[PDB]
Design an enzyme around this catalytic site. Structure first.
Site, PDB file in Angstrom:
ATOM      1  N   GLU A 149       0.850  -1.189   0.000  1.00 22.23           N
ATOM      2  CA  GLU A 149       0.000   0.000   0.000  1.00 22.23           C
ATOM      3  C   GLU A 149       0.887   1.241   0.000  1.00 22.23           C
ATOM      4  OE1 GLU A 149      -3.393   0.290   2.357  1.00 22.23           O
ATOM      5  OE2 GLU A 149      -4.179  -1.681   1.789  1.00 22.23           O
ATOM      6  N   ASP A 150       1.128   1.787  -1.193  1.00 24.95           N
ATOM      7  CA  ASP A 150       1.830   3.057  -1.380  1.00 24.95           C
ATOM      8  C   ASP A 150       3.293   2.991  -0.969  1.00 24.95           C
ATOM      9  OD1 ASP A 150      -0.404   4.277  -2.426  1.00 24.95           O
ATOM     10  OD2 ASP A 150      -1.053   5.137  -0.511  1.00 24.95           O
ATOM     11  N   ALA A 151       3.732   1.855  -0.439  1.00 28.55           N
ATOM     12  CA  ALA A 151       5.135   1.698  -0.092  1.00 28.55           C
ATOM     13  C   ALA A 151       5.973   1.538  -1.358  1.00 28.55           C
ATOM     14  CB  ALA A 151       5.327   0.499   0.840  1.00 28.55           C
ATOM     15  N   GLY A 171       4.666   8.178  -0.560  1.00 26.29           N
ATOM     16  CA  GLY A 171       4.974   6.815  -0.176  1.00 26.29           C
ATOM     17  C   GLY A 171       6.015   6.757   0.923  1.00 26.29           C
ATOM     18  N   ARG A 224      -6.110   5.602  -8.928  1.00 25.99           N
ATOM     19  CA  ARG A 224      -5.849   7.033  -8.991  1.00 25.99           C
ATOM     20  C   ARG A 224      -5.754   7.576 -10.411  1.00 25.99           C
ATOM     21  NH1 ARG A 224      -1.035   6.472  -4.371  1.00 25.99           N
ATOM     22  NH2 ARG A 224      -2.478   5.912  -2.686  1.00 25.99           N
TER      23      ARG A 224
END
Ligand SMILES: Nc1ncnc2c1ncn2[C@@H]1O[C@H](COP(=O)(O)OP(=O)(O)OP(=O)(O)O)C[C@H]1O
Ligand SMILES: [Zn+2]
Ligand SMILES: [Zn+2]
Ligand SMILES: [Zn+2]
Lengths: 46, 1105, 65, 34, 49
Positions: free
Chosen positions: B735-737, B878, B910
């Site tokens: 997740e966004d990492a 991130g 997105r």
RNA sequence: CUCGCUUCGG
């Protein structure tokens, strides 16, 4: 004991003792930095 | 046959920015205030005299502000640079002097230069020393040439006065009430009084409500009081449409029910409905009718002027208001407040003008009061003001108002807060975008609806994407790149031209002409300028005259056909935007004109004078037809858009291909990039701030918008280009990492510097004793300083170049305890820090009060690690989830291993296609050694970069054959490789990491403190308690909320039920029934507070069995 | 501030190729052909040299001296 | 003086934001909390 | 229900901070309200006398 | 230290 400082525009070594109004010869500028220490410092290349 | 296109048209934008634009708003407003407005204020208050002892006076002749100076030198001034004011924690001000003539002993004595105050000087203003200076001279003054300026320096901190937004005054507003009744309101505000008068229809008839009347009164009574007594004339003024008479009939019937038929009767009724202002001192003959007439002439509808008690114009104005209410009571054409044609912007100049007027009035009042107290009783030693003109009044008022940011004007009853804010020096973009902010009159204090929304009126004026993400979303806005705020005009030639253009005087005709279908009312700043027929000719002639130059180019004229009103606006604060004039489907601007502009033959002002480009106001652009591009121009087009990408603001200009992204991503990127880490300016090394973030090796972006070039962002970059490969790797980027390369971090990628400030003061007290610094306390055992005093120099101040550890003294400060031998107690300045820091410089200065100011600039070198926040200039914030070795990273055939692996899953939700296009364009540009442009609504197309990629031997879509670093086998799917401009954010895990032992507690309630800076513990909020209750974990809830936070043992008397101490009850004077009891300390505090409130809680204890 | 010694991704020595690069810009060379003549084949070193800003002399203009 | 070993080596040493007057010989925490 | 005595609370409810950097102390509102009440009592007694 | 105010983060 000679305490030495460097003014912000002359960049000249000024020796001033305690309780002296901060100034510089051949100028009137009043920001007076301290010189770098003489002690060895170890740094890591990391 | 496509219409010809002027390609160089965009070159008009830089020329405009040569004279106006980003920062020139505040600077121009401040220059106008200090060069014109202050003289006007002084002329308004030039003569001051006291009632006692006439023929005595104090007359101001001329006022000067001079150049910035410092009062450090003993009764001597000295030119001071702004950086010196930053370092010494003093204010950057100039002496307010004035020349006066007065009378000491009936002999006139004049002073030609008498100081009275100090103006904080806006940087880069007319009087600022930095103006008109070269970059070499800027370096000599230790100021960055790219610094926007426009901000004040007070007590060493940089304060910016935000542009205020407020509803325009003296305008009729038709609005629905809470109960749905469609009423009217007008806030008539003159230079002296602001009064909002209302009109209500609460019972099918119209009442007028004002703060000076005990009860709202029928409108017909007011009409009769204002001179017009015949009911037929009133009905003619209201309107001759049948439904208008049907609606207005009940008011006439209500008036006829009372016996009010003359002006005297209505005046008597109003005077009865009048309320005395708390027994106003002095009584001019039981005033009543006179009070009513004075309220009608002055207090009610102040902006509408009565020449000499002739209420004809006011009658017409209130009749127009009644007619608008009646018409709006049918079709629900209720005006909306969020329309920015009704909004006005107050810059720093107007606010400073109001503040200086208030301060000067207070100063003159104080002088007059001192004169009254001194002159009539003292001696033959005649009183003269010069011995009493205190100079700290104006200076202290200005400094306090600018620093604290709260403005209290009792003369205007204005209580504003948060006017000024600390300039944010996170990055160059941070300061530049904060310099163009606009605050709203309503605050995030509540969940409002409408202002928070993005109204279409913001087109070309305000940035749509740039808004703070959070509670203040939509209430703080940013100006567009190409916008201008108008100032006030003289208003004379407008009236002259309107009178000469056939506008009939309102007094010459009865109100019936207002109801005619072809008759149009012409207003001027809320005042009825008159009536006109064939308004098209009037509007065209007015616009032609404005283009010719006989009328100021910022005077706006608009037409409202629904209300049949021609509005002429000349007040300041209105938003304007330049547009290319289009006449008969061909723009006035040609290729030859742009060629001349490029060659330097003409500038933007030459375009203005030659009727090629004209400013459009929001109200005026409501009536115009604007074409975005040349091919959009049709027969009915009156203006042409200069450049569409000027719609976005300054921060939003950083986004490459912003039109390919979703708007929330653009807003997040604006917010993120306000917080981007990078260089501040060319003098960032000499500057000492409380917190500074620098990047070791900043790089200019590969895909740069034209806005980046315009604001010279590439000179001060705030990020680095990393070879990003878009793929899923190791499942550590869920997740966004994102995954970082260990070799890249080892080679300086993301390397950052954090500078913190540690300042100390050594002040001399009232008693002639001063703070002094001891030398390092040497250990006699080893003849070396103790570990705490290890870093100190011989003078007791830490020397630059050494490393500081936790709980080590930087300044060995000792201060006296007396205010006979002085007694010194030690208050050394210790360094609180989780990690080691290096002292880069130590600055020692002396103020005029003999206070020694010492500032240490501690430096930390931080490398990106797990938890460091990273952004990608597209709102894809991130966290570095994993740092893999270089060999584990996948590699292409050429041997390139990516620095950042970002998860593909972030794209579909997105829809940030702009990031993909930016990656492709950057790859093509670095391959062919070019800088591609991601300009909004334009930029390099995909086809060209694909052709460049195929020409250079790479795949035409960036996807490349990739071999897995771990298994050594090729990947089944092609990987999307390319350089992406990633920027590091100030949010670091090292600063945010927090852990709390028992620690300190609060004195009032013995619970752990609040913040990390105070070593506070985390908080179990109400919802956490609710979740624990829902789990049913009673023991853990008790342990968390009682044992681990504020456990205490009190002594309760089992007889009286009150709290005892030390096993003894003072109330019962006994100790037999006192029993110990465990309790939260907050509960004991509550019990004691209730006892103090006479709400006695008596505890009936019992055994636990 | 100053040109990094190593390329971030690959690790090729790029610090010694900065001033000579400026010479090629002091000459008539374009960006792309100058980068080719310097021997930067893969685009990461080209990004290193092309996107670097020389802030060291601008900062030295503010040095004590 | 230290209440345990009777020494006078009372040092004011704050350990992780906890002010603490402690004996420097036997480590006896004389006083803590401010 | 009608109060003729006021229970002034202990010092723990009303912490006082000795700001030795200046010649003053930080006091909560309760102490100042009690001071004003005592001053009013003294003023009323003086006026009656 | 207390208090308020702003700016952030989420
Ligand atoms: N005021 C707030 N109250 C509670 N949680 C908040 C608040 N602000 C942020 N958060 C936290 O952040 C999360 C909000 O993220 P969310 O709104 O789902 O995505 P987003 O911010 O719209 O991102 P995109 O714009 O979709 O990329 C959820 C919540 O735990
Ligand atoms: Zn000097
Ligand atoms: Zn008892
Ligand atoms: Zn490389």
């Amino acid at each position: 004991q000679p305490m030495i400082y460097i003014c912000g525009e002359c960049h000249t070594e000024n020796e001033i003792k305690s309780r002296d109004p901060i100034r510089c010869r051949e100028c009137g500028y009043r920001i007076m930095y301290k010189k770098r220490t003489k002690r060895l410092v170890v740094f890591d290349a990391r | 046959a496509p219409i010809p296109t002027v390609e160089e048209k965009w070159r008009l934008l830089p020329a405009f920015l040569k004279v106006k634009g980003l920062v020139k708003q505040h600077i121009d407003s401040f220059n106008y205030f200090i060069n014109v407005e202050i003289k006007k204020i002084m002329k308004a208050n030039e003569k001051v005299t006291s009632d006692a002892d006439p023929m005595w006076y104090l007359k101001y002749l001329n006022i000067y502000v001079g150049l910035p100076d410092v009062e450090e030198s003993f009764n001597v001034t000295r030119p001071v640079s702004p950086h010196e004011c930053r370092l010494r924690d003093m204010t950057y001000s100039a002496p307010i002097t004035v020349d006066i003539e007065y009378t000491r002993g009936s002999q006139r004595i004049i002073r030609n230069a008498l100081p009275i105050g100090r103006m904080p000087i806006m940087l880069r203003s007319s009087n600022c020393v930095l103006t008109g200076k070269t970059p070499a001279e800027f370096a000599k003054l230790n100021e960055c040439p790219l610094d926007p300026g426009g901000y004040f320096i007070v007590k060493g901190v940089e304060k910016v006065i935000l542009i205020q937004e407020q509803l325009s005054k003296n305008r009729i507003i038709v609005e629905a009430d809470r109960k749905g009744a469609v009423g009217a309101s007008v806030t008539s505000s003159t230079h002296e009084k602001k009064s909002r008068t209302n009109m209500a229809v609460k019972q099918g008839r119209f009442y007028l409500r004002h703060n000076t009347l005990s009860e709202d009164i029928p409108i017909v009574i007011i009409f009769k009081a204002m001179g017009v007594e015949s009911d037929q004339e009133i009905v003619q003024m209201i309107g001759t449409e049948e439904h208008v008479m049907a609606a207005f009939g009940p008011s006439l019937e209500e008036c006829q029910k009372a016996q009010i038929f003359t002006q005297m009767q209505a005046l008597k009724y109003i005077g009865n409905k009048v309320r005395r202002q708390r027994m106003w001192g002095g009584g001019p003959k039981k005033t009543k009718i006179e009070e009513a007439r004075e309220l009608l002439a002055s207090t009610i509808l102040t902006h509408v002027p009565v020449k000499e008690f002739n209420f004809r114009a006011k009658c017409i104005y209130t009749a127009v208001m009644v007619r608008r209410v009646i018409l709006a009571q049918g079709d629900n054409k209720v005006d909306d407040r969020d329309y920015y044609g009704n909004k006005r912007l107050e810059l720093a100049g107007q606010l400073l003008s109001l503040l200086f007027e208030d301060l000067f009035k207070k100063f003159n009042s104080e002088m007059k009061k001192i004169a009254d107290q001194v002159i009539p009783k003292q001696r033959a030693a005649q009183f003269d003001v010069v011995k009493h003109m205190r100079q700290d009044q104006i200076t202290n008022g200005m400094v306090n108002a600018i620093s604290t940011g709260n403005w209290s004007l009792k003369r205007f009853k204005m209580d504003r807060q948060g006017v000024t804010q600390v300039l944010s020096r996170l990055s160059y973009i941070s300061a530049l975008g904060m310099m163009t902010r606009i605050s709203s009159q309503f605050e995030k204090t509540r969940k409002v609806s409408g202002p928070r929304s993005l109204q279409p009126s913001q087109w070309g004026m305000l940035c749509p994407s740039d808004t703070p993400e959070g509670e203040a979303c939509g209430l703080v806005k940013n100006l567009a790149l190409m916008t201008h705020i108008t100032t006030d005009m003289e208003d004379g030639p407008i009236v002259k031209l309107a009178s000469n253009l056939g506008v009939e005087d309102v007094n010459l005709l009865c109100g019936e002409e207002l109801s005619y279908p072809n008759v149009f009312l012409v207003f001027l700043n809320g005042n009825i300028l008159g009536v006109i027929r064939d308004h098209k000719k009037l509007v065209n002639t007015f616009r032609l005259m404005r283009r010719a130059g006989y009328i100021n180019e910022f005077v706006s004229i608009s037409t409202n056909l629904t209300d049949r009103c021609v509005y002429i606006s000349s007040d300041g604060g209105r938003l304007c935007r330049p547009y290319i004039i289009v006449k008969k489907q061909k723009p006035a601007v040609t290729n030859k004109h742009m060629e001349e502009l490029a060659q330097g033959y003409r500038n933007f002002e030459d375009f203005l004078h030659e009727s090629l480009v004209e400013y459009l106001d929001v109200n005026e652009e409501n009536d115009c037809n604007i074409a975005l591009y040349e091919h959009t121009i049709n027969k009915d087009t009156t203006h042409l858009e200069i450049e569409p990408f000027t719609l976005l603001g300054v921060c939003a200009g950083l986004i490459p291909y912003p039109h390919h992204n979703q708007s929330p991503r653009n807003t997040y990127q604006c917010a993120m990039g306000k917080q981007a880490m990078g260089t501040i300016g060319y003098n960032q090394r000499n500057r000492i701030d409380t917190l500074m973030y620098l990047l070791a090796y900043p790089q200019k972006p590969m895909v740069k918008t034209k806005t980046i070039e315009l604001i010279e962002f590439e000179k001060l970059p705030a990020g680095q280009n990393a070879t990003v490969a878009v793929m899923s790797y190791s499942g550590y980027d869920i997740e966004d990492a994102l995954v970082l390369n260990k070799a890249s971090l080892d080679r300086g990628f993301g390397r950052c510097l954090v500078y913190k400030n540690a300042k100390c003061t050594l002040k001399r007290y009232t008693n002639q004793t001063f703070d002094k610094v001891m030398g390092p306390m040497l250990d006699a055992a080893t003849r070396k300083p103790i570990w705490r005093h290890e870093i100190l120099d011989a003078d007791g101040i830490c020397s630059p170049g050494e490393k500081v550890e936790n709980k080590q003294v930087l300044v060995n400060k000792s201060m006296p305890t007396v205010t006979q031998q002085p007694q010194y107690k030690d208050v050394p300045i210790t360094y609180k820090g989780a990690t080691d820091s290096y002292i880069e410089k130590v600055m020692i200065s002396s103020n005029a009060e003999d206070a020694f100011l010492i500032k240490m600039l501690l430096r930390q070198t931080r490398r990106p690690e797990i938890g460091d926040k990273f952004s990608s200039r597209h709102g894809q914030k991130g966290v570095c989830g994993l740092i893999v070795p270089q060999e584990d990273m996948p590699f292409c055939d050429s041997g390139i291993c990516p620095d950042i692996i970002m998860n593909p899953h972030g794209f579909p939700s997105r829809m940030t296609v702009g990031k993909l296009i930016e990656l492709l364009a950057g790859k093509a540009g670095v391959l062919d050694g070019r800088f591609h442009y991601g300009t909004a609504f334009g930029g390099s197309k995909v086809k060209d970069v694909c052709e460049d990629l195929v020409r250079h031997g790479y795949n035409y879509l960036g996807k490349d054959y990739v071999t897995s670093g771990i298994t050594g086998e090729p990947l089944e799917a092609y990987i999307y490789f390319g350089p992406v401009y990633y920027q590091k954010l100030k949010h670091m895990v090292l600063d945010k990491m927090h852990a709390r032992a028992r620690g300190p507690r609060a004195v009032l309630t013995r619970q752990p403190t609040e913040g990390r800076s105070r070593d506070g513990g985390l908080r179990l909020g109400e919802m956490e308690r609710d979740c624990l209750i829902g789990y049913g974990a009673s023991m853990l809830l008790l342990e968390r909320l009682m044992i681990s936070s504020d456990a205490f043992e009190v002594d309760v008397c089992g007889q009286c039920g009150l709290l005892g101490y030390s096993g003894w009850c003072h109330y019962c004077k006994s100790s037999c029934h006192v029993s110990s009891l465990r309790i939260p300390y907050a509960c004991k505090l509550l019990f004691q507070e209730l006892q103090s409130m006479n709400i006695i809680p008596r505890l009936k204890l019992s055994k636990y069995n | 501030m100053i040109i990094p010694v190593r390329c971030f991704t690959c690790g090729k020595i790029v610090g010694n190729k900065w001033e000579a690069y400026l010479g090629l810009l002091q000459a008539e060379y374009t960006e792309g052909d100058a980068l080719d003549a310097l021997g930067l084949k893969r685009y990461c070193c080209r990004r290193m040299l092309l996107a670097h800003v020389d802030l060291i002399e601008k900062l030295l203009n503010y040095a004590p001296l | 003086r230290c209440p345990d070993c009777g020494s006078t080596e009372l040092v004011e040493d704050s350990h992780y934001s906890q002010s603490q007057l402690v004996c420097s010989d036997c480590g006896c925490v004389v006083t803590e909390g401010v | 229900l009608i109060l003729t005595r006021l229970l002034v609370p202990p010092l723990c409810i009303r912490p006082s901070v000795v700001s030795d950097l200046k010649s003053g102390t930080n006091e909560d509102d309760l102490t100042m309200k009690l001071t004003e009440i005592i001053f009013l009592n003294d003023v009323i007694k003086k006026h009656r006398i």
